[PDB]
Chains A and B, each alone.
Chain A
Amino acid sequence: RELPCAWKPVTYEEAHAPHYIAHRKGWLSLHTGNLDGEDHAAERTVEDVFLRKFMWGTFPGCLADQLVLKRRGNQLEICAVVLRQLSPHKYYFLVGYSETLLSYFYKCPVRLHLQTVPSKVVYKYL
């Protein structure tokens, strides 16, 4: 263009800035590690990193939004939001596959909670 001539849909998580994390947004992962006195916060962080990368590479172009990783006791719930573009048979295949891999990789009863949506739920435009 020209020098003084210079002088995108976003979901809720994308729209709101980091300084709203406890004001408007929430926390994607929920666990006891960061509480006072509790241990293994770093191990939970590393587990979260691996889960997010694995899920984004195992459901490519399906996840409409970011994961929600809940932990109760030794349970590990992945609440994901996906699109209605892939066939349900492939979704069932991938759910079973991912559940079994993550259970045998983290030695805990992992479980997965797909929620399909017709399309990205755009909050605003930035």
Chain B
Amino acid sequence: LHVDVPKDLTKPVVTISDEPDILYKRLSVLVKGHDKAVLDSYEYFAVLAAKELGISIKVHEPPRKIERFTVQYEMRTLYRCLELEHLTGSTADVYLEYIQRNLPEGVAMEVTKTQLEQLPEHIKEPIW
């Protein structure tokens, strides 16, 4: 668009509620695919998005698995693990929505979230 541009845009309504935010110590994202190049492209995408949102990310590659069965057929499952650390509940929600909506076909995700909680008041002292 050279001249015809939207004069103003309706930004979505994000409300700062009163309730306190969840805190995640760690957030491990394990993505599984049949293709290593697809997982590498997804890793590049997710890592760049993490940097652009300020999240702290580390990437490693769990060993692959190969299921053979019987003429001999074979199925390779390759893994990529993206460990985010020290992100709140809202950052986690928005980042996960982004990277799950942009999950390529044939790739599955397992997100393990490690929430930080305080002791219940009921356990602070023994009952007398």
Contacts and interface: CB of A to CB of B under 8 A. Distances in A.
Interface of A: 22, 27, 30-32, 34-38, 70-73, 77
Interface of B: 32-34, 65, 67, 75-77, 103-108, 110
Contacts of B76: 22
A71 B105 contact: yes
B117 to A, nearest CB: 28
Given A36-B65, A36-B67, A36-B77, A31 B32 contact: no
Nearest to A36: B77
Given A36-B32, A36-B65, A31 B105 contact: yes
A37 B75 CA distance: 12
A38 B105 CA distance: 14
A74 to B, nearest CB: 12
B77 A30 contact: no
Question: Which 9 pairs from chain A and chain B are nearest by CB?
Answer: A30-B106, A32-B108, A36-B77, A30-B105, A70-B105, A72-B105, A35-B32, A35-B108, A35-B77
B67 A72 contact: no
Contacts of A73: 103
A30 B107 CA distance: 9
Given A32-B106, A35-B34, A72-B103, 6 more contacts: A22-B76, A27-B34, A30-B105, A32-B107, A37-B110, A72-B105
Contacts of A32: 32, 106-108
Nearest to A31: B106
A22 to B, nearest CB: 8
Nearest to B110: A37
A46 B97 CA distance: 30
A21 B76 CA distance: 13
Nearest to A75: B105
Nearest to A77: B105
A83 B28 CA distance: 46
A69 B127 CA distance: 62
Nearest to B34: A35
11 contacts: A27-B34, A31-B105, A32-B106, A32-B107, A32-B108, A34-B75, A35-B106, A37-B110, A72-B103, A72-B104, A77-B105
